[PDB]
Amino acid sequence: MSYNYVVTAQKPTAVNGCVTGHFTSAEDLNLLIAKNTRLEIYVVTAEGLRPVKEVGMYGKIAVMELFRPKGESKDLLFILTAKYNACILEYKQSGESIDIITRAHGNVQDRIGRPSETGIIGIIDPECRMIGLRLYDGLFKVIPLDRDNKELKAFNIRLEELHVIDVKFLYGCQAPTICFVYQDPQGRHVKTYEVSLREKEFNKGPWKQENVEAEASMVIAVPEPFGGAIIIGQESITYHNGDKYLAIAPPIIKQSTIVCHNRVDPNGSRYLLGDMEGRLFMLLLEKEEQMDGTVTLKDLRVELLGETSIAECLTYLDNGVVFVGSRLGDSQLVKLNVDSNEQGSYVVAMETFTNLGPIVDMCVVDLERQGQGQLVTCSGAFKEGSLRIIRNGIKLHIRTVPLYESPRKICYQEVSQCFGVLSSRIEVQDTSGGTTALRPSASTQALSSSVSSSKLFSSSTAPHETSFGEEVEVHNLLIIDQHTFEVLHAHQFLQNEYALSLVSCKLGKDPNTYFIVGTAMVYPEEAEPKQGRIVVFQYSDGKLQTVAEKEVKGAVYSMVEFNGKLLASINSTVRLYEWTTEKELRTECNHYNNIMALYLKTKGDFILVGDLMRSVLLLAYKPMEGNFEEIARDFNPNWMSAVEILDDDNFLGAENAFNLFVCQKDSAATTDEERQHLQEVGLFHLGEFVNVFCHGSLVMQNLGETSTPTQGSVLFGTVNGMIGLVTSLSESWYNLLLDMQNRLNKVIKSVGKIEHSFWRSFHTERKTEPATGFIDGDLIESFLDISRPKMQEVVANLQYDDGSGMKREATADDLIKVVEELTRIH
């Protein structure tokens, strides 16, 4: 019933994995990067990185590890997707035609099985005898590495330890041995098991259960000379090997958790460790020959090299160069100098690869062309937080504005030629009583500055005290220039005040354009917020002044400009305020809902409301009555991340396991019961987590109306930096394109032989249905990149209609013209 088209405007930029090895040829060194559904292959040169091949998979890359089996020229690549599609890929080049051929594949999902708390863990034995996968608690799946195993037939092994944290395959063992840290009611422990492929079961490990630290989170197998393994926790780093057990508690690692590692020297003498706050350390393992040549670990040392981007993964390339794979910020290439610099750091940045990072909010603005729109996003988190202005070339051109603090919400104000941005910075509790900042950020380095006057809650405050060292986030409304992007003004909110919503509009008869902010007073003892405000600000003469302030009984989660009035949402209530002649908000309506009004979107007199559990609700303001009325709803429990009104009857949303869905106002409805239900009319597994939906387009709006094939345009921002676009089609165009997708799938070569139908099928841990009411634009647009006989095969015995009449045999040149028209929407 809904006919939609979805396409990628910007591919996912956030790096979730990186591995080095010899994938292309045994001689040259490669770096493989996993950017969610994309896989980039580079060659490591003395200058930097040389791009060799980039491929797209029909699946979110969960595991990615290289390995060289016995009797193979170069390394093979094992990949596992989020939907459990396992595959062994090989790099094959013929003259100037590069192709990633699928040596073996198969789905490794188990119908019945509770997925693990620590997610998917995929490891390979150092001698390539097997691939060990930990997908579900209580079971260890084993895919034996035999030349006969092409479908990836595997068997599960009963594991008595339910809560396994991390697991690795040990080096220098007679039989394949796994080492893992797990938790039980007596705390955390490290245990080993020998994996028998003949018996298809576990055997006694070389060194049975050993007690580890309370927060033991990482396991690292050490190569042949040393042997054994390194277990990293919060306060300590310990090395275990048979009888010996050395443990060190260096104070330099206590301030933050080590969340990623990488081997530097192939013997295991050096390792790179990265914490949550961007620090980079060097873990060194001192050796001891011991006459006979057994070689034992003498000592462990940790050295702080310096600061990088918040690293998700790390990988030592060569000659002091390390690739810093980041999710919250830009990924990098950094040089590790033997001697430090004047500041004391041993790290020096070489390249900075742009990452649109977690796009938490965004907006579309014209800015300078006065016709062509540009997209301004709230990107990254913490020191990696920034703004990004994405625009078309007229390829996408990106301009970065670093903030050094977390940006949260963004809106534009044309009247004052500037942007309003809600943002938060982390400060630490000082001995003196007050708080101290970590680094100088956008809110601390503002030209004009101000603090909110405590009136409402200065008197009405709960009794409590904050202890030394505790972190506290400081919220600010930043006024940023549209041209220079300098922080013109920074307004700090009250103590314990969390700023949630932000709008820029004209209310009532008032000709001034105000920046309205919705907040919530967040105390730790108080679970659900019972206090908040709506602050009306006016930016003029380089200063921000508080026009009005309205106290509320809850958290102002969302606000929208509603026909010259302010529509706000306080917890379960959806309230309508009117802007009086005395310049104050006055309540006109209230609507008490069965859900928490988190998501608030509007179209004319219609109001779309939604909560975190995908409870969708459609209200309507009755003007003659002067109150709200519920039109329809659809409550199916599932996690919802964003929502939007496509047209008067259709509503788009983003629900659990990276899916997109469309709800529709039931037509041909006789009964009130059926009129009051929104029918699910479209489902599609996007493979990205949407945070913001935004009406607009990044292409020339087109002055003269020349029969557009697509109607409407909704852009969207995701956690991986991917930007997509959604649009509506006609029944004829949909049925054509749908038939086209199924023809395209027969001729297109999928990496890992994963089915497109299976990939885009709506999926959750409980239910998995096929995709409906959605045309895969990435698949349709790939038609222009294919070869003329494959186009001839796709258009073979296919009927194309150009409108009104002439329903003739479709040709590749007619279809090329149609797909070329679709590529112009982004």
């Binding site: 979730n16 994995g17 997925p115 708390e117 620590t118 997610g119 809560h163 944290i165 938790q183 009611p185 705390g187 955390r188 309370a214 927060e215 989170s217 990482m218 969340v259 990623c260 949550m276 998700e312 993964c313 999710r327 919250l328 977690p358 938490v360 909010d361 988190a381 913490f382 977390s406 969390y498 967040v522 730790p524 003892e525 679970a527 659900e528 917020p529 379960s572 008490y592 809902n593 069965n594 859900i595 928490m596 988190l598 909560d611 975190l612 559990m613 409870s615 429990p637 599932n638 996690w639 991340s641 659990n656 396991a657 990276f658 987590f689 945070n691 913001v692 956690v719 841990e765 409980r766």
Partner: protein
């Protein structure tokens, strides 16, 4: 053992005509059967699946029901009581259902075509957005299980900070995700249940949120028509959030014995002395009364004349007050002796006689229905 049907499956099961009260999955249903058709029907069920339907009536007079619960028989015994031969049976609530058809047989017993409503179980709200690097930090190093240490909000602060760290990648804060967290929601209920009445928490309530949510839905002091709302909810998260809303909406107090009489509202509570609104006072015979002071109270009858003998609030005379319906003792009406006294007339209610409840709107002038939140 245990007989369980498939999710969203269509089944036809019998309905015992004597039954009427709502049965929540997990809670037990004791039955006393006298009529041979009821006994014979139950004896057949023992040989078959041992399961029958318990309809959740909207109106028991007209026998109107849209949902219900399958009841599995786990105990049968042919007893004798008061010179009457009666069979006693115990059943336990299992699956929830939506009523499709209610065909009535030749006997008083009726069959019921029903669709099994599934138990919605969702993963952690952060499961999707969690960083691979931070997956290993998601696990906690055991519970503090020291009443004082977990009642202290410093542990729940550490829990929130760790579990919902990746809320920074999303458009919402950590504290919002806690409002849809099973463990946090259970703890909030436990704390408010202890606030209502002092009791042993470890023994009385289960650790599982599915089991916990049902246990609470059965024990809440509410109307069975309101209870249907909890039966309709399929997600234990939504079920717990709804229970906390119901709990927060119990702003009135009623006769614990009959529960048909709204005595007073929390708004009428007031502090006469600096001790507090509620305080324990002993009478001249050693009976201790935890007494709540309220400005106004109603649905009470006064017994005898006022007396100043051993008054707990000097300057006032007590008059014994009892429930208009069941005559159970609710407390006393304190009436001032002098004209210069501040409240002049107030009420001292005994805590043990009262029970929390949602303010009823029996008047047909403005009956605004209770709108529960998920």
């Amino acid at each position: 053992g245990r007989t369980l049907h498939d999710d969203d499956s269509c089944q036809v099961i019998p309905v015992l005509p004597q039954v009427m009260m709502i049965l929540i999955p997990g809670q037990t249903l004791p039955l006393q059967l006298f009529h041979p058709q009821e006994v014979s029907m139950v004896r057949n069920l023992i040989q078959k699946d041992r399961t029958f339907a318990v309809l959740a009536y909207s109106n028991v007079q007209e026998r109107e029901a849209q949902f219900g619960t399958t009841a599995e028989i786990y105990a049968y015994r042919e007893e004798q009581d008061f010179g009457i031969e009666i069979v006693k049976v115990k059943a336990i609530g299992r699956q929830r259902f939506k009523v499709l058809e209610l065909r009535t047989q030749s006997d008083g017993i009726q069959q019921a075509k029903v669709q099994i409503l599934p138990e919605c179980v969702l993963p952690s709200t952060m499961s999707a957005v969690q960083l691979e690097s931070l997956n290993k930090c998601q696990i906690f190093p055991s519970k503090p299980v020291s009443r004082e240490d977990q009642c202290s909000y410093k542990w729940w602060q550490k829990y929130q900070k760790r579990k919902f760290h990746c809320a920074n990648l999303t458009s919402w804060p950590r504290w919002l995700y806690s409002l849809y967290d099973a463990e946090t929601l259970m703890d909030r209920i436990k704390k408010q249940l202890r606030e209502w009445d002092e009791n042993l928490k470890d023994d009385s309530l289960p650790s599982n949120p599915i089991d916990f949510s049902y246990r609470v839905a059965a024990c809440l002091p509410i109307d069975d028509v309101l209870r249907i709302q909890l039966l309709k909810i399929g997600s234990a998260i939504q079920r717990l959030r709804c229970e906390l809303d119901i709990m927060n909406k119990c702003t009135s107090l009623c006769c614990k014995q009959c529960q048909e009489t709204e005595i007073t509202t929390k708004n009428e509570i007031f502090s006469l002395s600096l001790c507090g609104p509620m305080a324990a006072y002993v009478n001249p015979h050693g009976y201790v009364h935890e007494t709540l002071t309220v400005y106004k109270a109603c649905n009470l009858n006064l017994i005898g004349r006022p007396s100043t003998e051993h008054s707990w609030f000097p300057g006032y005379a007590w008059t014994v007050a009892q429930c208009k319906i069941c005559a159970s003792h609710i407390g006393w009406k304190f009436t001032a002796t002098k004209k210069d006294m501040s409240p002049q007339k107030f009420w001292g209610l005994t805590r043990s006689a009262l029970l929390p409840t949602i303010p009823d709107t029996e008047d047909e002038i403005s009956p605004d229905k209770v709108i529960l939140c998920l």
